[PDB]
Amino acid sequence: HMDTSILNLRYESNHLIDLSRYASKINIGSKVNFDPIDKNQIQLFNLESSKIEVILKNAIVYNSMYENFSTSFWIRIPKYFNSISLNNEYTIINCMENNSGWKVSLNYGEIIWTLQDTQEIKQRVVFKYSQMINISDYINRWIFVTITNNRLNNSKIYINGRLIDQKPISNLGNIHASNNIMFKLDGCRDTHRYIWIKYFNLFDKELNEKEIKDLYDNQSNSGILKDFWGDYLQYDKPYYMLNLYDPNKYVDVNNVGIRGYMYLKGPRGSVMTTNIYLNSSLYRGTKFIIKKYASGNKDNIVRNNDRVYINVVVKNKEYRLATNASQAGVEKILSALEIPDVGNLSQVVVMKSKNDQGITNKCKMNLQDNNGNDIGFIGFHQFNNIAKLVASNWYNRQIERSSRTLGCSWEFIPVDDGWGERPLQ
Numbered sequence: 001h002m003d004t005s006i007l008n009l010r011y012e013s014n015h016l017i018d019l020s021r022y023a024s025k026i027n028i029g030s031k032v033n034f035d036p037i038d039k040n041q042i043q044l045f046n047l048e049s050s051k052i053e054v055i056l057k058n059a060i061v062y063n064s065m066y067e068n069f070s071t072s073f074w075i076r077i078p079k080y081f082n083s084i085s086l087n088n089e090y091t092i093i094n095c096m097e098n099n100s101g102w103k104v105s106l107n108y109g110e111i112i113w114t115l116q117d118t119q120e121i122k123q124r125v126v127f128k129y130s131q132m133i134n135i136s137d138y139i140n141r142w143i144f145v146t147i148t149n150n151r152l153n154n155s156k157i158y159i160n161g162r163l164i165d166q167k168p169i170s171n172l173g174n175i176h177a178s179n180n181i182m183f184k185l186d187g188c189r190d191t192h193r194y195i196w197i198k199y200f201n202l203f204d205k206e207l208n209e210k211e212i213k214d215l216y217d218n219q220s221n222s223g224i225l226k227d228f229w230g231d232y233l234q235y236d237k238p239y240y241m242l243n244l245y246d247p248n249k250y251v252d253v254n255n256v257g258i259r260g261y262m263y264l265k266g267p268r269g270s271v272m273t274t275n276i277y278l279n280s281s282l283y284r285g286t287k288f289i290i291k292k293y294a295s296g297n298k299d300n301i302v303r304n305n306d307r308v309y310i311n312v313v314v315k316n317k318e319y320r321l322a323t324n325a326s327q328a329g330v331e332k333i334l335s336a337l338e339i340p341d342v343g344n345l346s347q348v349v350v351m352k353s354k355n356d357q358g359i360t361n362k363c364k365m366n367l368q369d370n371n372g373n374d375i376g377f378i379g380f381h382q383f384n385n386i387a388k389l390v391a392s393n394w395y396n397r398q399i400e401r402s403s404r405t406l407g408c409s410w411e412f413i414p415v416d417d418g419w420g421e422r423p424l425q
């Protein structure tokens with residue numbers, strides 16, 4: 001019954017603007033980069049001119065002993081690669097003046113919130129993520145940050161709608177924040193560092209748990225499927241495949257044609273920089289390309305419920321993922337077929353977004369016959385110790401979001417500069 005956002009930065013009507021009633025003024029530097037496909041995604045480099053300043057209407061400048069307030073935004077932070085990034089806290093969102101106010105800063109594996117009163121009393125709340133981990137929910141993936149502040153008790157940091165850390169701030173006095181907000185890498189020693197950011201909001205209350213969940217859901221664009229990094233999933237774009245039940249395996253073929261089969265094999269192998277990161281290799285196996293079938297939309301964005309074809313790239317040539325549904329048993333083994341030779345075989349796939357408590361960006365792929373009847377979600381099944389890819393209605397008959405739909409949960413991984421791995425070929 002009341003929108004509590006007092007700043008809402010959004011790309012609309014050809015400009016990045018504040019949608020709130022305050023219409024705070026925005027100044028964009030010459031070295032700010034925008035995503036051509038998703039116009040709201042903003043890239044800030046470690047350069048002077050790569051910045052955005054917001055001039056706040058005076059009535060919303062924070063100068064108080066008592067007022068509760070919150071902030072939210074989405075961020076995508078490239079993997080830290082070099083020891084130059086160790087022990088180097090750098091500001092990214094600045095509303096400090098004369099050593100009072102608030103800021104968001106980053107450090108190796110950290111997102112930090114700092115409040116400081118006019119007597120120089122400080123409090124920090126921190127989200128810490130490891131870079132020594134097989135598959136990270138956080139490294140180089142879009143994350144939803146929310147920070148809330150109750151002047152009588154705690155400051156809280158949430159990540160993807162989940163509470164991470166809370167610390168008391170009731171000892172802080174008057175906090176006199178800056179007249180402007182500066183989005184800019186300030187004090188970062190790594191010359192190659194950047195961030196992606198979108199949807200920055202300020203709120204004039206402490207947001208509650210539900211409000212934060214709703215904000216997360218709404219801002220996530222659930223009508224559009226996402227790749228592994230959290231960007232829009234696209235047609236005609238090569239992707240490496242991740243199966244969430246077996247994250248240490250990758251997709252391979254051996255032989256194309258109807259006597260061949262797709263399968264999962266492991267382990268993936270590792271990428272490493274000693275003391276800096278140790279992760280599973282992501283660029284392994286045969287790449288998949290999503291192809292337009294039924295969609296009436298002209299763009300290359302894959303939408304929830306889009307019926308598509310899936311192509312497999314083998315030796316730089318495209319083949320069609322298909323199966324003969326007539327085969328005995330509920331599990332229908334998938335093959336990589338010459339596109340002209342697919343005939344009446346089952347090949348149409350319905351793309352669907354999943355969302356739950358686990359990792360973000362999950363996709364399901366429901367194979368259908370040519371009459372539109374379900375063959376089943378694409379997962380895998382053991383045949384003589386070989387984990388062959390299959391379409392199976394066994395998945396569709398399982399309880400939703402429960403652990404038995406893990407095997408048919410996939411993510412699509414394109415090569416990305418914030419990951420830094422070199423493909424083997």
Ligand SMILES: CC(=O)N[C@H]1[C@H]([C@H](O)[C@H](O)CO)O[C@@](O[C@@H]2[C@@H](O)[C@H](O)O[C@H](CO)[C@@H]2O)(C(=O)O)C[C@@H]1O
Nearest residue numbers: 329330331381393394395396397398399403404405
């Ligand atoms: C709750 C229950 O009965 N669970 C069964 C399970 C279900 O039938 C299935 O998961 C659907 O929910 O099936 C089980 O596996 C069976 C094998 O033990 C048996 O040798 O062969 C069966 C098929 O002919 C079937 O595969 C399973 O998945 O564990 C048995 C389990 O109790």
